[PDB]
């Protein structure tokens, strides 16, 4: 499945690489004497005790439990749907390392790191079995072996006779001992996270305009926190109220430097929180001491058109441009446009208490069918 | 660019702040914050129906309520009303003067109109046509 | 705050520092007559080693040489000191219905879908750009609108709502589009959109109600326009035009006064 959007957030580039593999299941088999790589998923020679061509010194197994779970039931919220997708449960004894001859995993995200979490649940499964049965087998000097040759061991007691899986070789040449090709079992440990976390709250650029292919409203940003003028990230944009089908809505601009967070410490899923005016920007009015001026702004080029607060002088003037509503407190009321204007109505009746004036220089029409007086 | 929200924030307002790429250096507010020694407007509650904005000082609530029970929006001064309620009626309802200036004012009504005044009603002009 | 009262978590972070001054083992010989909590002492030594100590364990060790030796065990190795173990994570999450808040605040009460939990709520703090005194942005979220949550001093215990998100279960509405012209918030419960609208291209200021707009377009006219009945009640109202006017209706006109003058 193709993706969306990866991120590498400044990593180390091959820190990248084996936190991919861990995500993909698969693991590398690097290649000495060479600079081929056969990258392979997780999925015989038959040294034995009575077999003459490969002598043997010491065979170490460790057989742990502690870190072996059984499950796996690895599940994400879905932004579409909104049902936290149905648990993949992983059954234990699918990929089984070491075959013998004779507790539940469970987290839930806040994000969605792949299209569907079956591979990921399988490969977290799969890498917390090779840290189950893990040794090495000390053996005399071939080069006939290789870290993905599931070799088997048979003539032994029953403690150790199975069929195990390699992980590497080590050849080991000195004065004493001769050549010794240590044959490897098992990995280490494993850190289990979905992506190499960034846990800063980052400021980004909005960028021009793009249709989100994913078909959510997410809005297309850059991040100079990377060097990349040219590639755009999508991101997700928090609004205060926003609703089911009545929001805020006021959707930033192409030039605004937001500051974004990143849900779950996900490079994949950024996220607008604020939007940050700057000295490129020169916001309407700097804070000051006595704070009186409020009220949101609009103005594209010429024309300022939002309502405005003046606290000290007890005020609401709605703005389009020359066209002030201004209700003051304790005081007057005035439309006070430049233009026409207009009142239509069912029934309008409007009333005032012991004065009236109407006036007008040029003609006065009170047009109608009966007038009373 | 040059239009924006712009409150800039009381000095007693309790912001919650986050650190920029993780440097002590640049904080950043980030909300706001109501708490008890403010004392919100009025409390979240069941049947979410008050909303709108307040600004308010000393004893001047100034800004716009929706109440979605009453479907109106009514734009406060201290006294001047303005409450367009949906599917119903609209007023100015102002207990002082008020003016409506216009280079060519025209109001009109379908099938009723009212003039009042208890005082004197003058309708001041050149030409005055019937 | 961690707790209701710092006593006792202050109480218990300088007990846990002072197990790391003194400590080491005392190599015995095989007896089962002590236990991890005995607080022996030494007597019969020098000036340096003589007191009560507190043991934290016994180590019986069999073996071939040595015979049976039980190691006592003094002092507590090392303490993070961290109040909670932190996660420092943004996580969304959904409101959950409405709970009053039994600590008094004004947390709303929500869930986190990273935990998975459906049936237990979270009470959450709410942040609003403006918030104030007693004046206030206000709109506090409908129950199912997906709020981010992050946590305060990355305690799991002190969540707070910083955004609210539109998603497609809710259709936000109008999509963000180039030409971004429509601005304006909205309030809509069931059928009636009632608020103020900014279409930047038009230049207008339009505030709803369902059919009651106001709708003051810049460099231009201004419309009441309702399909009902408006009245303008004004101590003194005066209304004046410069060089038109024109009063109207279909039936009835009534200038009804006392004194009218023309």
């Known amino acids: 499945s193709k993706h969306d959007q990866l991120l590498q957030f400044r990593l180390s580039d091959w820190q990248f690489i084996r936190s991919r593999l861990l995500s993909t299941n698969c693991w590398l088999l690097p290649d000495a004497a060479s600079d081929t790589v056969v990258i392979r998923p997780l999925s015989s020679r ?29 599940q994400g919220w879905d932004i579409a749907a909104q049902r936290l997708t149905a648990a993949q449960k992983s059954p234990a004894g699918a990929f089984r390392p070491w075959k013998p001859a004779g507790q539940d995993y469970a987290l839930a995200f806040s994000m969605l790191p792949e299209a569907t979490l079956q591979t990921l649940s399988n490969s977290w499964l799969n890498y917390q079995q090779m840290t189950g049965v893990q040794g090495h087998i000390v053996l005399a000097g071939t080069r006939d072996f290789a870290p993905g040759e599931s070799i088997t061991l048979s003539g032994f007691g029953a403690g150790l006779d199975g069929t195990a899986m390699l992980s590497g070789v080590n050849q080991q040449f000195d004065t004493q001992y001769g050549w010794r090709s240590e044959l490897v079992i098992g990995l280490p440990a494993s850190m289990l996270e979905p992506a190499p976390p960034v846990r800063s709250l980052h400021i980004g650029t909005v ?17 100079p926190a990377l060097n990349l003028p040219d590639s755009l990230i999508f991101a997700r944009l928090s609004k205060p109220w926003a609703s089911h089908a009545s929001g805020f809505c006021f959707y930033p601009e192409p030039g605004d430097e937001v500051v974004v967070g990143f849900i779950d410490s996900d490079p994949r899923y950024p996220m607008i929180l604020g939007a940050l005016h700057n000295p490129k920007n020169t916001a309407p009015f700097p804070p000051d001491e006595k704070n009186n001026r409020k009220g949101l702004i609009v103005s594209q080029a010429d024309q300022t058109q939002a309502l405005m607060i003046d606290t000290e002088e007890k005020t609401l003037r709605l703005m389009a441009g020359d066209n002030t509503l201004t209700l003051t407190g304790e005081g007057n009321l005035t439309m006070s446009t430049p233009n026409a204007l207009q009142l239509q109505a069912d029934t309008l009746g409007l009333q005032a208490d012991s004065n009236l004036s109407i006036a007008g220089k040029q003609q006065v029409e009170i047009t109608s069918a009966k007038i009373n007086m």
Do not use: K, M, V, W
């Not at 038959?46 to 690895?74: G, K, W």
């Not at 292919?213 to 809005?219: A, K, S, V």
């Open 46 to 74: 038959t040294l034995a005790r009575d077999s003459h061509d490969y002598t043997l010194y010491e065979i170490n197994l460790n057989f742990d439990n502690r870190f072996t779970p059984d499950s796996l039931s690895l």
């Open 207 to 223: 960028a021009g305009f793009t249709a989100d292919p994913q078909h959510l409203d997410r809005i297309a940003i850059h991040l």
